[PDB]
Structure formats: structure tokens, C-alpha cells
Amino acid sequence: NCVADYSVLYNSASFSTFKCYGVSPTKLNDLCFTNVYADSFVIRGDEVR
Amino acid sequence: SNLKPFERDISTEIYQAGSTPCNGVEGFNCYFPLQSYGFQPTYGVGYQP
């Protein structure tokens, strides 16, 4: 129940890596979704793989 | 943008993905548009050439 702007997170140099293939990230904004799961947590640097 | 029928394209110009202008041979949101496949005798159907 909100409008999700992914451009700000998309075009900020304050991140290390941004990876996903389920949909091309440039067209995330124009695709409409039902629920968003934010899995936010911490891991080791090299364990992202 | 997608190319028209039988429109061969050979250019290997580094593609810009984000807002920042694409400078140098590499950069954030700058990518070499060509990728190599994987072909080995160990592979199975679907990934064989």
C-alpha cells in the first residue's frame, strides 16, 4: 500500500553492489507488485556470493 | 534499442546503464556489451552449442 520509487536507490553512489536478474532493474518502477519482502541484515564482505 | 531485421551490429562500445556519463573502458553502470558463452564436453543439453 504505497508507491515505490527505485530510482533513488538505483542512482546513488552510496552502495557497493546491486545484483538481480529476475527483472531488468531499469524497468522495476513501471512494474506493479502485490507485496514487498525487505530482507535486511548483515553478512561478511566476501560472503555475498 | 532493439535492432531491425537483418541489421547486423558489430560495435563494441561500452554501454551506459545509469545517469552518469559512460567514461573510460569501464565504470559504474558501464559495461562491455559482449559476453562469452560456456561450451565444454562436460555440458548437457540446453547448454551445448
Burial of B30 (0-12, 13-18, 19+ CB in 10 A): middle
Instruction: Give CA–CA dist A11/B29, Å, rounded.
Output: 10
Residue B25 has what DSSP assignment? S
Q: CA nearest B19 in A: which residue? A: A11
Helix (H) or strand (E) holding A8: helix A7-10
Instruction: Give CA–CA dist A43/B22, Å, rounded.
Output: 31
Experimental technique, in short, is cryo-EM
Per-residue CA distances from A15 to A39, B38, B41 (Å): 16, 30, 40
Say whether A40 sits in a helix, a strand or coil: coil
The set of cell numbers assigned to B45 is 543439453
The set of cell numbers assigned to B17 is 546503464
Resolution value, angstrom units:
3.8
Instruction: Give CA–CA dist B49/B46, Å, rounded.
Output: 8
How many C-beta neighbours within 10 Å does residue A14 have? Answer: 5
Sorted by sequence, the CB contacts under 8 Å of residue A36 that are 6+ apart come out as A4
Chain A residues with beta carbon closer than 8 angstroms to that of B28: 13
Q: Select from A7, A8, A9, A11 the residue whose CB has the most chain B CBs within 10 Å, as the one to mutate to test that interface.
A: A11
Chain A residues with beta carbon closer than 8 angstroms to that of B18: 10-11
Instruction: Give CA–CA dist A16/B38, Å, rounded.
Output: 28
Residue B16: strand pairing partners: B30
Give the distance from residue B18's alpha carbon to the nearest chain A alpha carbon, in angstroms.
Answer: 7
